[PDB]
Each structure stands twice: as C-alpha cells, then as structure tokens.
Amino acid sequence: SGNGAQGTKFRISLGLPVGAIMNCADNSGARNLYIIAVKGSGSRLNRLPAASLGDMVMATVKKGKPELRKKVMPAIVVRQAKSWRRRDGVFLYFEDNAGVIANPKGEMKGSAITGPVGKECADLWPRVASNSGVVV
C-alpha cells in the first residue's frame, strides 16, 4: 500500500505470506506473481510479512514473458481466498489469490484485468478502478 493509493485501507486479515504465489490477473505477459515482501508491514521476530486485498508487494515472475522474468517489481493484490470480513458484517472469499503487476505510483502495466476484483482494492488504486470489470 501507501504511495500513490489515495484512500485508506481498513484492516483485512492477511492471507498472503512471503513466498506465496498468486495468479496474475492482467495481460502483461506475467502469469504468476511470487511475493517477496509487503510494503508497510512491520517487525516482530519470526512473523512473516503477509498481504491482503489491495496491498502492494514486491514480487517476481516465475511463469511468463521471459522479459518479465528474473527481476523484481511491485504488484497489487486484487483477489483473496483467505476469508476476510468487512465492517458490513460479512465474511467473504475469492477462488484464487491474484494480483496485477504495477509500478510504484500504483499504475498498471497491463491493458486490463481478467476476473472479478475486490472493492476494498478498487477504492484504493484509481487505475485498478479503471481496468477492472466486475468489482466485488
């Protein structure tokens, strides 16, 4: 999260610890996103930096366009599966864990986003608002 996201993310249960690998939801060449850290997250010996909806994580590409391989870029978590809960009282979960590679300024690299997307995330990044179809 943080830089370039206007808005504020109410806490939702983390579900993506470092090393998790999540479906790439856009069309940049990237197929999967493997998480190496989570901006914002803090310190407590032996905790694993975990991420949730509309979090921003440094990631790599394990499967995809050999030009998107072997290097590190930011990305944005857009689908969950670890049942979180909103203030509206409901517990909800997606089918996969999914992201869309992005620049630090929260900007996409992709043309659009395949699959549904968390609203908690939409409100967070204006350009994820754009390229998303079905939201939440």
Q: Shortest approach of Mg ion to residue 99 CB, angstroms?
A: 18
- Asked if residues 26 and 108 have their Cβ atoms less than 8 Å apart, the reply is yes
Spatial separation of the C-alpha atoms in residues 49 and 47, rounded to whole Å: 6
State the binding string over 55-94 for other proteins (x if CB under 8 A, else -).
----------------------------x---xxxxxxxx
Is residue 134 involved in binding other proteins (CB under 8 A)? yes
- Give the pairing type, strands 98-101 and 21-24: parallel
Closest listed residue to residue 15, CA positions, set 40, 51, 42: 51
Q: Does 43 bind RNA (CB under 7 A)?
A: yes
- Contacts with other proteins by CB under 8 A lie at 7-8, 10, 44-46, 83, 87-96, 115-116, 123, 133-134, 136
